[PDB]
């Protein structure tokens, strides 16, 4: 199915303190492959995946170059926006970039993104077109006209549509043992008591890749968020994911309730419902 | 493999 | 990434049009012209970015190819002033500019 | 809103020479070239932002420095038995879009 290949930024200004933090990630689908880390001692870009370690010096001495790069435009950038909102210089403040290009099936281009947030909040985005920009505030339009003036756009365009799509396909192949894989989720259910009265059900998905899971509890009524607690998805650590979701019942009919799972592992969607 | 151009905010 | 321009001498008589080419293998999202004179930095004339486009100065004509693969700079009567180095420049995928080599033009009066 | 300086040079081989070029453009992006006898630019230096710098295509021989943003030297060491050119420095608002450049400098190394 579709892949994707993601690269988060961050930095942080720390005030009065000194040089600001600044962290690299990037992510071939759920999978992370490469970190850089201003405060690790090594200053450069560093291989987080056995398929990447293959990648011979000359790929490694550009991406450090062009994440140093990066590093020193995210250092000025934090100045700038402490201008555009007069804050002081005594708040410690924090940017956040994200870009990359998604395929589908076939490995051909589906679709682009490049945004970045501030202090939290959406700040810039370039659109699902790749012509034009969203602006959040009118700080972020200072920012607008600036690289519309310097058709950033159309320079963004032909990496996103173009070498990222490249990139993404020669790890597809190099990665493919790790990367072209799907677990299929293994599944069971919990029973507990609240009290005396009513009882929880909780229904349990484990180690499946990649993360996108469907969970969602059913009963001979039909659908209800009657506290369906649904956690979030969770790494296992070892590559695959995990997620949780209760109902509660009344404490004398738990086989009127479906658990239906869904994952692009299942040649068929899954329906647990409780063994007594 | 990153942009290789960088631009200011 | 590679800028050929075409051809590298061109002398004409004043009051004749001319076109020179700029060509490439690979899109560029954005595209300049300079003229230099001996001894002297390169003046920027245009910039160019949307396929088709057409953009004019003086007695000059430039074009951006449909498909953004190539430039030409066309100019009609000719004059004893339009003589200098023309270049044309891409937008690099390593944050310069790739440049052609240049066409010297001689314009005879 | 770029300038060099100062238009010629003349220095003895082996004699360590700084050229200056500074712009109140705004760019954050400065580059330097060398051009020779009736030919084209050849990229020896670029520097994309702020304390951040890259080798162009002739960069053997040469060093720059990029620590405000309105100046980028560049010192002509004894590099490649290379260095009588006509040197030009450009400026962009950002990298990779259109340049500016410099009237030049003139450096001639006599033996």
């Known amino acids: 199915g579709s892949h994707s290949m993601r690269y988060f930024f961050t930095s942080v200004s720390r005030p009065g303190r000194g040089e600001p933090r600044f962290i690299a990630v990037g992510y071939v689908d759920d999978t992370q492959f490469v970190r850089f880390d201003s405060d690790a001692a090594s200053q450069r870009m560093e291989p987080r995946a056995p398929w990447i370690e293959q990648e011979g010096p000359e790929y490694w001495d550009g991406e450090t170059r062009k994440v140093k790069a990066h590093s020193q435009t995210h250092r000025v950038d934090l100045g700038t926006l402490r201008g555009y909102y007069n804050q002081s210089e005594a708040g410690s403040h924090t940017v956040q970039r994200m870009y990359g290009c998604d395929v589908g099936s076939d490995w051909r281009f589906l679709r682009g993104y490049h945004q970045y947030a501030y202090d939290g909040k959406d700040y810039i985005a370039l659109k699902e077109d790749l012509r034009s920009w969203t602006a959040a505030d009118m700080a972020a339009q200072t920012t607008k006209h600036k690289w519309e003036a310097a058709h950033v756009a159309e320079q963004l365009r032909a990496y996103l549509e173009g070498t990222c799509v490249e990139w993404l396909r020669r790890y597809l192949e190099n990665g493919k043992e790790t990367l072209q894989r799907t677990d299929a989720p293994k599944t069971h259910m919990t029973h507990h008591a609240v009290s005396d009265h009513e009882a929880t059900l909780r229904c349990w998905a484990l180690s499946f890749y990649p993360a996108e899971i469907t969970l969602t509890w059913q009963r001979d009524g039909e659908d209800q968020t009657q506290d369906t607690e649904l956690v979030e998805t969770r790494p296992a650590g070892d590559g695959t994911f995990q997620k949780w979701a209760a109902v509660v019942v009344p404490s004398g009919q738990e086989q009127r309730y479906t658990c239906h799972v869904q994952h692009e592992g299942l040649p068929k969607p899954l329906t647990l419902r409780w063994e007594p | 493999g990153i942009l290789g151009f960088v631009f200011t905010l | 990434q590679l800028l050929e321009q075409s051809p590298q001498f061109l002398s004409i008589q004043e009051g004749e049009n001319l076109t020179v080419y700029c060509n490439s293998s690979?899109?560029?999202?954005?595209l300049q012209w300079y003229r230099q004179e001996p001894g002297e930095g390169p003046v920027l004339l245009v910039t160019v970015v949307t396929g088709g486009e057409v953009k004019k100065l003086k007695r000059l004509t430039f074009q951006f190819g449909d498909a953004r693969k190539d430039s030409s700079l066309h100019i009609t009567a000719a004059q004893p002033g339009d003589t200098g180095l023309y270049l044309c420049?891409?937008?690099?995928?390593?944050?310069?500019?790739?440049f052609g080599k240049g066409t010297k033009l001689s314009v005879k009066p | 809103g770029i300038t060099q300086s100062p238009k010629y040079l003349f220095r003895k081989e082996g004699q360590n020479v700084t050229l200056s070029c500074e712009q109140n453009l705004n760019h954050d992006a400065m580059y330097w070239y060398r051009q020779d006898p009736g030919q084209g630019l050849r990229l020896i230096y670029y520097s994309q932002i702020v304390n951040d710098f890259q080798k162009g295509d002739i960069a053997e021989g040469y060093s720059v420095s990029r620590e405000k943003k309105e100046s980028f030297p560049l010192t002509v060491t004894s590099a490649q038995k290379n260095p009588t050119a006509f040197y030009l420095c450009?400026?962009?608002?950002?990298?990779?879009?259109?340049?500016?450049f410099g009237p030049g400098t003139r450096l001639t190394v006599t033996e």
């Open positions: 420049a891409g937008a690099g995928s390593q944050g310069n500019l790739i």
């Open positions: 690979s899109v560029f999202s954005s």
């Open positions: 450009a400026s962009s608002s950002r990298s990779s879009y259109e340049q500016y």
